[PDB]
Scaffold this active site. Structure first.
Site, PDB file in Angstrom:
ATOM      1  N   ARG A 150     -26.849 -52.921  94.033  1.00 21.36           N
ATOM      2  CA  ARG A 150     -26.360 -52.576  95.362  1.00 21.36           C
ATOM      3  C   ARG A 150     -26.156 -51.064  95.371  1.00 21.36           C
ATOM      4  O   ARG A 150     -25.708 -50.484  96.360  1.00 21.36           O
ATOM      5  CB  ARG A 150     -25.034 -53.281  95.674  1.00 21.36           C
ATOM      6  CG  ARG A 150     -25.197 -54.717  96.090  1.00 21.36           C
ATOM      7  CD  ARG A 150     -23.871 -55.326  96.423  1.00 21.36           C
ATOM      8  NE  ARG A 150     -24.094 -56.452  97.311  1.00 21.36           N
ATOM      9  CZ  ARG A 150     -24.200 -57.715  96.920  1.00 21.36           C
ATOM     10  NH1 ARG A 150     -24.092 -58.042  95.639  1.00 21.36           N
ATOM     11  NH2 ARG A 150     -24.434 -58.657  97.823  1.00 21.36           N
ATOM     12  N   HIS A 187     -33.807 -61.825  87.537  1.00 24.93           N
ATOM     13  CA  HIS A 187     -32.405 -62.220  87.698  1.00 24.93           C
ATOM     14  C   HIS A 187     -32.331 -63.733  87.522  1.00 24.93           C
ATOM     15  O   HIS A 187     -33.338 -64.378  87.271  1.00 24.93           O
ATOM     16  CB  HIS A 187     -31.954 -61.979  89.155  1.00 24.93           C
ATOM     17  CG  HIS A 187     -31.849 -60.543  89.553  1.00 24.93           C
ATOM     18  ND1 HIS A 187     -30.651 -59.859  89.564  1.00 24.93           N
ATOM     19  CD2 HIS A 187     -32.784 -59.673  89.995  1.00 24.93           C
ATOM     20  CE1 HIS A 187     -30.857 -58.629  89.993  1.00 24.93           C
ATOM     21  NE2 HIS A 187     -32.141 -58.489  90.257  1.00 24.93           N
ATOM     22  N   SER A 188     -31.125 -64.290  87.647  1.00 28.60           N
ATOM     23  CA  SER A 188     -30.873 -65.733  87.548  1.00 28.60           C
ATOM     24  C   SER A 188     -29.526 -65.873  88.295  1.00 28.60           C
ATOM     25  O   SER A 188     -28.815 -64.871  88.445  1.00 28.60           O
ATOM     26  CB  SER A 188     -30.807 -66.267  86.110  1.00 28.60           C
ATOM     27  OG  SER A 188     -29.545 -66.059  85.504  1.00 28.60           O
ATOM     28  N   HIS A 224     -27.946 -57.413  85.834  1.00 29.93           N
ATOM     29  CA  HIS A 224     -26.659 -58.091  86.006  1.00 29.93           C
ATOM     30  C   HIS A 224     -26.414 -58.710  84.622  1.00 29.93           C
ATOM     31  O   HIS A 224     -27.149 -59.597  84.166  1.00 29.93           O
ATOM     32  CB  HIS A 224     -26.708 -59.159  87.093  1.00 29.93           C
ATOM     33  CG  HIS A 224     -26.733 -58.609  88.488  1.00 29.93           C
ATOM     34  ND1 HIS A 224     -27.558 -59.110  89.470  1.00 29.93           N
ATOM     35  CD2 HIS A 224     -26.044 -57.592  89.059  1.00 29.93           C
ATOM     36  CE1 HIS A 224     -27.385 -58.426  90.583  1.00 29.93           C
ATOM     37  NE2 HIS A 224     -26.468 -57.502  90.365  1.00 29.93           N
ATOM     38  N   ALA A 225     -25.386 -58.210  83.952  1.00 29.32           N
ATOM     39  CA  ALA A 225     -25.012 -58.658  82.619  1.00 29.32           C
ATOM     40  C   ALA A 225     -25.015 -60.135  82.257  1.00 29.32           C
ATOM     41  O   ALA A 225     -25.642 -60.520  81.272  1.00 29.32           O
ATOM     42  CB  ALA A 225     -23.679 -58.042  82.235  1.00 29.32           C
ATOM     43  N   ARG A 226     -24.355 -60.967  83.057  1.00 30.42           N
ATOM     44  CA  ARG A 226     -24.273 -62.410  82.783  1.00 30.42           C
ATOM     45  C   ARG A 226     -25.501 -63.306  82.926  1.00 30.42           C
ATOM     46  O   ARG A 226     -25.464 -64.470  82.494  1.00 30.42           O
ATOM     47  CB  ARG A 226     -23.121 -63.020  83.589  1.00 30.42           C
ATOM     48  CG  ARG A 226     -23.322 -62.955  85.097  1.00 30.42           C
ATOM     49  CD  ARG A 226     -22.116 -63.540  85.789  1.00 30.42           C
ATOM     50  NE  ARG A 226     -22.244 -63.595  87.246  1.00 30.42           N
ATOM     51  CZ  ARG A 226     -21.263 -64.008  88.050  1.00 30.42           C
ATOM     52  NH1 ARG A 226     -20.091 -64.339  87.532  1.00 30.42           N
ATOM     53  NH2 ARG A 226     -21.436 -64.051  89.363  1.00 30.42           N
ATOM     54  N   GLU A 227     -26.584 -62.755  83.476  1.00 23.43           N
ATOM     55  CA  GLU A 227     -27.844 -63.484  83.705  1.00 23.43           C
ATOM     56  C   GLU A 227     -28.684 -63.468  82.431  1.00 23.43           C
ATOM     57  O   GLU A 227     -29.822 -63.019  82.437  1.00 23.43           O
ATOM     58  CB  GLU A 227     -28.551 -62.838  84.916  1.00 23.43           C
ATOM     59  CG  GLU A 227     -27.667 -62.948  86.197  1.00 23.43           C
ATOM     60  CD  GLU A 227     -28.121 -62.151  87.426  1.00 23.43           C
ATOM     61  OE1 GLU A 227     -29.225 -61.614  87.489  1.00 23.43           O
ATOM     62  OE2 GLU A 227     -27.351 -62.038  88.396  1.00 23.43           O
ATOM     63  N   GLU A 237     -35.464 -64.964  90.721  1.00 24.86           N
ATOM     64  CA  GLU A 237     -34.119 -65.499  90.450  1.00 24.86           C
ATOM     65  C   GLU A 237     -34.560 -66.756  89.668  1.00 24.86           C
ATOM     66  O   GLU A 237     -35.105 -67.700  90.241  1.00 24.86           O
ATOM     67  CB  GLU A 237     -33.352 -65.837  91.724  1.00 24.86           C
ATOM     68  CG  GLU A 237     -32.730 -64.618  92.372  1.00 24.86           C
ATOM     69  CD  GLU A 237     -31.417 -64.184  91.704  1.00 24.86           C
ATOM     70  OE1 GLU A 237     -30.918 -64.886  90.803  1.00 24.86           O
ATOM     71  OE2 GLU A 237     -30.874 -63.132  92.082  1.00 24.86           O
ATOM     72  N   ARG A 252     -20.658 -58.994  85.448  1.00 25.90           N
ATOM     73  CA  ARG A 252     -21.978 -58.749  86.002  1.00 25.90           C
ATOM     74  C   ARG A 252     -22.279 -57.294  86.281  1.00 25.90           C
ATOM     75  O   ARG A 252     -23.429 -56.881  86.230  1.00 25.90           O
ATOM     76  CB  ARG A 252     -22.176 -59.567  87.282  1.00 25.90           C
ATOM     77  CG  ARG A 252     -21.410 -59.044  88.476  1.00 25.90           C
ATOM     78  CD  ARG A 252     -21.338 -60.063  89.601  1.00 25.90           C
ATOM     79  NE  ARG A 252     -22.648 -60.438  90.118  1.00 25.90           N
ATOM     80  CZ  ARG A 252     -23.304 -59.784  91.075  1.00 25.90           C
ATOM     81  NH1 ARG A 252     -22.786 -58.701  91.647  1.00 25.90           N
ATOM     82  NH2 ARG A 252     -24.503 -60.210  91.454  1.00 25.90           N
TER      83      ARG A 252
END
Ligand SMILES: [Zn+2]
Length: 401
Positions: free
Chosen positions: A237, A288-289, A161-164, A362, A219
């Protein structure tokens, strides 16, 4: 450049089933342009949502009109983004003469440059493996740590996920940490003598470039959909694990869009093919975050998996080890229990494929900064996360299957 001047992040706490149904509708209403940092799950659990400046009042009125309780978690998103940009360029100028600072965010090019340096400096332990290309033709480069032989392996990836951002940063620090402790720490030495470690620091390179150049909140991947003016698929997903089922969206314009078919994203297909070709991957860990959670399958169904007791024990051990360093608390459990039902996740596919030790982390924090975690927290985050990762790796080493 997308600005977020005035955007507010609200923490909402639905108390019953109806309030949840109301929040899910809002989330599903693509035209309202809300950005759910943490989706609504069950009554009593908080949800976090970034509301564009222009819609702040209207959304608050609607919330109150439904008697939904909320509070302002982040007053102005732009304030945080400006500090992030400032600290980032400051570091960039200092790296012009100085060394690479792992306690800072870097560009894709800078990350790749550092990965090549690592391989250059330790040719007998680290090598670069190309597993494919992204939608926009960027190479999917994995770092292979090995002492030689045809060993079983541990898979570790970050940044799907790009923004993490803290994930890619944590993965790069981890690569340096492995080579720094190998032959020094008896544990990492024995783990590497028994298994190979494959590390993919930037799993979604196109999305990352886009989040740094055009939209910090992006994301998804950047694939082009046939018949849609919308872009991207949620790479977490898109896996072949209850694909298309509840806990994903069929709307191409949704940030939770599952894609046209399982493994439709080349970034995902590359990973699946590498794993099937390798044939001896024993652990699969994904970073992830944010939220501070350590989870295992399943996400697509909420029944306990076969190895529930063992996985629960392992994750608990890893969470306690991580806590020892700075006192950071992590919630532990199957995905469906910790968050809620979500289909097409990577660890559900890996477990179903036969990789028993499949976990998803996370990282920090729990909402104060969210995805905009200040650079000064990168090192503390990577150090404590290393303790949890090591604990899982030691178990894999000691429990062959
Ligand atoms: Zn994520």
């Amino acid at each position: 450049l997308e600005t977020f001047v005035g955007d507010q992040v609200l923490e909402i706490v639905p108390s019953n089933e109806e309030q949840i149904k109301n929040l899910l509708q809002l989330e599903a209403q693509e035209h309202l342009q809300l950005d759910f940092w943490k989706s609504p799950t069950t009554p009593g659990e908080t949800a976090h949502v970034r509301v564009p400046f222009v819609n702040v009042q209207a959304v608050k009125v609607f919330l109150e009109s439904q008697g939904i309780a909320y509070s302002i978690m982040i007053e102005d998103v732009q304030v945080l983004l400006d500090k992030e940009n400032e600290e980032m360029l400051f570091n960039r100028r200092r790296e012009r003469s100085g060394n690479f600072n792992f306690g800072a965010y870097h560009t894709l090019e800078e990350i790749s440059q550092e990965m090549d340096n690592l391989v250059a400096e330790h040719p007998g332990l680290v090598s670069k493996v190309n597993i494919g290309s992204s939608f926009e033709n960027r190479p999917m480069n994995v770092l292979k740590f090995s002492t030689g032989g045809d060993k079983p392996a541990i898979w570790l990836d970050a940044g799907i996920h790009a923004r993490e951002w803290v994930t890619q940063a944590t993965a790069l620090w981890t690569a340096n940490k492995i080579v720094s402790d190998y032959g020094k720490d008896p544990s990492i030495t024995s783990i590497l003598d028994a298994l190979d470690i494959f590390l993919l620091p930037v799993t979604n390179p196109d999305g990352y470039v886009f989040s740094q150049t055009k939209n910090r909140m992006w994301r998804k991947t950047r694939s082009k959909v046939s018949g849609s003016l919308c872009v991207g698929v949620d790479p977490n997903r898109n896996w072949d694990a209850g694909f298309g089922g509840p806990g994903a969206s069929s709307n191409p314009c949704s940030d939770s869009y599952h894609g046209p078919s399982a493994n439709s994203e080349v970034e995902v297909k590359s990973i699946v093919d590498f794993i099937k070709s390798h044939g001896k991957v024993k652990a699969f860990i994904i970073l992830h975050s944010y939220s501070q959670l350590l989870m295992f399958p399943y996400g697509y169904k909420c029944t306990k998996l076969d190895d529930f007791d063992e996985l629960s024990e392992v994750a608990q051990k890893a969470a306690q080890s991580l806590r020892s360093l700075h006192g950071t608390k992590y919630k532990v459990g199957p995905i469906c229990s910790v968050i809620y039902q979500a289909s097409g996740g990577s660890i559900d596919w890996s477990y179903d494929y036969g990789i028993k030790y499949s976990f998803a982390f996370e990282l920090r924090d729990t909402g104060r900064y969210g995805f905009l975690l200040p650079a000064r927290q990168i090192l503390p985050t990577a150090e404590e996360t290393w303790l949890g990762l090591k604990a899982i790796m030691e178990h894999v080493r000691d429990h062959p299957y």
